[PDB]
Amino acid sequence: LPWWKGAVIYQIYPRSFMDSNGDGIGDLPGIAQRLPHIAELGADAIWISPFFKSPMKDFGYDVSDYCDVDPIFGTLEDFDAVIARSHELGLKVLIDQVYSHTSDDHEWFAESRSNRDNPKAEWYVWADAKPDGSPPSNWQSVFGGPAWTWDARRGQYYLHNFLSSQPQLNLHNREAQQAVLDVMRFWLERGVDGFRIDALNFAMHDPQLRDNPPAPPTDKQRTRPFDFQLKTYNQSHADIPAFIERIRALTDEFDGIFTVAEVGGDDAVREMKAFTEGETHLNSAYGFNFLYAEALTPQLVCSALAEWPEEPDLGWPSWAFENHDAPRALSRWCTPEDRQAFARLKTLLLMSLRGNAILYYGEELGLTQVDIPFDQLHDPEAIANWPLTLSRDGARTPMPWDDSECAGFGSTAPWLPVGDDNRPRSVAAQLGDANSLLKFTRQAIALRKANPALHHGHVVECNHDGDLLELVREAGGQRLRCRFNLGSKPVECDCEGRTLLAINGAEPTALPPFAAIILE
């Protein structure tokens, strides 16, 4: 019965939650003021995306000091206040930990790149050019172009799976391993309740520097060099789990800690279970099954869930429909016509999946993707790979609190725009509206919490037939039948039970368009 098993986690993007000093950017005092929103929602924890000292090339995921707060967001004083307010509200607090790379402006890299003999020479991945000047391997950056960059300081290439500004850490190096573990300890000694571990399968590359093989044609249009090749050797080294053991060993030194890993790629499930196996690795992990899905299908849900059987040493999966890395799901999965009814099907479904619900800021209000022009881009990835981008900027818009000029974000000049379609969806307006998605999400969260078959139950059946999904889950004497219509065709279901919840005119025997019902 660990607190995290069955939790809902509300992910905060601190640049766009609440700007408490009027510069156009969210900040930690902003988050402190707004925390009651999350509490009243009934989320068990917050996960704060990176707020550490950073040049902000990957907007905080390029860390230059692992143990301080960036001036953009306030101070270490302000982080201790978010922890204390959260705990007073009964919220657990998770922070992002970014261990596959640092900024190029990090003190470790400034030492590493200085020459070939320094104590940190080997904390990053250095290799000579080919005799013709070429890079040491054919590896390609996640964000466009190659995964290696020249440094004349050393007369060598250095590896970066992401921007040239995010040189890959060499976690094969036990001194680097020890250093990032000591960073995690710093954060654990400040009362943090655990971690979201960034791109954990990028922690470790192949020391042999073998070329990646060509990718088969899964004819998703190829957007960038990275899409041409299987990520065989640039990442996913067999030794990552041994490193994760030292993490769990470290978190076991403190009370009631939760770890969840982000795990990228289509090679996904094998490293997720390896990263979460038994009680020696991480608690949980999430992948991109929903983040990169064009459509929400029953077959995609029964595919995803089938990967995580209740076997005795298997991990506990986490689910993310949307976050800062993928367009707002309502802009992917449904027409404007269908949006209102779909938003509640989707929210109820997230709460009915076996695993943890990763709710992203704005998801409880039904915020839509804001289209960001090429002139107005921030994400380097998009400028490089236009028009075939990851569309992350439009996912990162300021949280709308009221219907004021600044929508209560704290700035008539925010760093990204609110979006005309998100302005009417503000938390204030939704607190006045009795059928609001804010009020529905509360209800979905309360129904998961109070029902042990939703909260944690086994998936005893997952049945898919065209647009109909049925989840049969079960725990503590309870057996629930969860029926979902992911389609605009009224579908006819043989129940013989009690309706816990019915939406969009769902009945025990019939499901109109985008209707769902939980039967006990």
Numbering used by the authors: 5 to 497, 499 to 525
Quote the study on this structure.
Here we detected a novel GH13 family α-glucosidase, QsGH13, from the deep-sea bacterium Qipengyuania seohaensis sp. SW-135. The α-glucosidases (EC:3.2.1.20) are members of GHs and are widely distributed in all organisms that are specific mainly for the exohydrolysis of α-1,4-glycosidic linkages at the non-reducing end of polysaccharides, such as maltooligosaccharides, and release α-D-glucose. The GH13 family belongs to the GHs members and is mainly composed of (β/α)8-barrel fold catalytic domain A, a loop-rich domain B, and a conserved domain C. The enzymes of the GH13 family catalyze reactions mainly through a double-displacement mechanism, in which catalytic nucleophilic (Asp) and acid/base catalyst (Glu) play an essential role. QsGH13 is highly substrate specific and only hydrolyzes sugars containing alpha-1,4 glucoside bonds.
The crystal structures of QsGH13 molecules were fully built to 2.2-Å resolution with the satisfied Rwork and Rfree values of 21.83 and 27.38%, respectively. According to the diffraction dataset, the QsGH13 crystal belongs to the monoclinic space group P212121, with unit-cell parameters a = 58.815 Å, b = 129.920 Å, c = 161.304 Å, α = γ = β = 90°, which contains two monomers per asymmetric unit. QsGH13 has typical and conserved characteristics of the GH13 family, where the catalytic domain A (residues 1–107, 176–463) is composed of a typical TIM barrel, sandwiched between the loop-rich domain B and the conserved domain C, and it is mainly composed of (β/α) eight-barrel structures, including eight α-helical and eight β-fold. The loop-rich domain B (residues 108–175) is derived from the domain A, including an α-helix and three β-fold, which are involved in the formation of QsGH13 dimers and forms catalytic pockets with domain A. Domain C (residues 464–525) is composed of multiple highly conserved β-folds that stabilizes the entire protein structure. The QsGH13 monomers formed dimers mainly through five hydrogen bonds and 105 non-bonded contacts. After the superposition of two monomers, the root-mean-square deviation (r.m.s.d.) value was 0.250 Å using the DALI server. QsGH13 forms a deep and narrow catalytic pocket of 14 residues in (β/α) eight-barrel structures (TIM) away from the dimeric interface. Although it is not clear how many amino acids are involved in the catalytic process of QsGH13, we found that eight residues in the catalytic pocket, including Tyr65, His105, Arg200, Glu266, Asp202, Phe292, His328, and Asp329, are conserved in the family of GH13. The β → α loop 4 of QsGH13 is located above the catalytic pocket, and it is associated with substrate specificity. The β → α loop 4 of QsGH13 is demonstrated to be more dynamic than other regions of QsGH13 and the β → α loop 4 of HaG and XgtA by IUPred2A analysis.
